């Protein structure tokens, strides 16, 4: 990408990655890291918290707790 | 043609039956260990000393005054008599409950195999 002379050693870690989005700061100076071997996704659960049925909001707010 | 089927239709019935009888008999003896666990429950529950009608001979029961509700048989070995605690019975029963459990289940596939197979022998006979 760019040009060939522009090939450079970088001070840091090279990452082929998925850089985040959604209002992620695209740069954060001086940051501790969470390097996840994991995959967060969500833990599929219909009921973990707030079992109460009040609004149709709430029934899905039950499974919102994953 | 059908002569093969007619012999094949009649044969596959009995192995359903032979196996239908077997597993049906494998629940009862499995269930008595459940009940031998259960008979032990009311045993401890009443107390030592109660009159127990206990099987005596054909057409009789002998009443007897209970002692040591903790007394239980466990028959293992061939016929061998192992008298055990009220606790030891329940698990030894449950072993032989689980022991006949699989023994029940081994039959059903071979029970059902000779029916749908026989059922296939009914059609081409008539059809």
């Amino acid at each position: 990408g760019r040009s060939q002379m522009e090939s450079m050693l970088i001070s840091g870690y090279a990452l082929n990655c998925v850089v985040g989005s959604q209002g992620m700061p695209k740069r954060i100076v001086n940051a501790k890291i969470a390097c996840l071997d994991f995959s967060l996704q969500k833990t599929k659960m219909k009921l973990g918290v707030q079992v109460v049925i009040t609004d149709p909001e709430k029934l899905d707010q039950i499974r919102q707790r994953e | 043609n059908l002569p093969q089927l007619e012999m094949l239709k009649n044969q596959l019935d009995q192995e359903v039956e032979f196996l239908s009888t077997s597993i049906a008999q494998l629940k009862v003896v499995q269930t008595k260990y459940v009940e031998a666990k259960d008979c032990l429950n009311v045993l401890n529950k009443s107390n030592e000393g109660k009159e127990l009608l206990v099987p005596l001979t054909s057409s009789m029961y002998v009443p007897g005054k209970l002692h040591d509700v903790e007394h239980v048989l466990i028959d293992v070995g061939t016929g061998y008599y192992v008298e055990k605690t009220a606790e030891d019975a329940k698990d030894f029963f449950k072993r032989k409950i689980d022991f006949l459990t699989k023994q029940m289940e081994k039959i059903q596939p071979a029970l059902q195999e000779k029916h749908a197979m026989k059922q296939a022998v009914m059609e081409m006979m008539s059809q």
Partner: protein, 102 residues
């Protein structure tokens, strides 16, 4: 003819109770477990033959080492009677059939 299944019967006969022993085999290893964990708490009788007898612990123990001799003895002997009868059964099958057909 008569000579066919005479042998296969006592074949099938000592076959199954032998296999009954295999259940009892586990039990005969478990009765070595059950009585050895009985210190004389519950009264140990041998059940050996129709007389049910006031027994002692070594009488309980030495018996089940001897009760395994059921699974030992009855199982083994039949593997003779299996083929002891089986071969003479197999032998007599083609002989008398070919005759009555011929």
């Amino acid at each position: 003819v008569e000579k066919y299944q005479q042998l296969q019967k006592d074949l099938s006969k000592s076959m199954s109770g032998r296999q009954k022993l295999e259940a009892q085999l586990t039990e005969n290893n478990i009765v070595k477990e059950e009585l050895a964990l009985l210190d004389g708490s519950n009264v140990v009788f041998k059940l050996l033959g129709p007389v049910l007898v006031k027994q002692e612990l070594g009488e309980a123990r030495a018996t089940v080492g001897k009760r395994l001799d059921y699974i030992t003895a009855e199982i083994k002997r039949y593997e003779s009677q299996l083929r002891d009868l089986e071969r003479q059964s197999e032998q007599q099958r083609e002989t008398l059939a070919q005759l009555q057909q011929e």
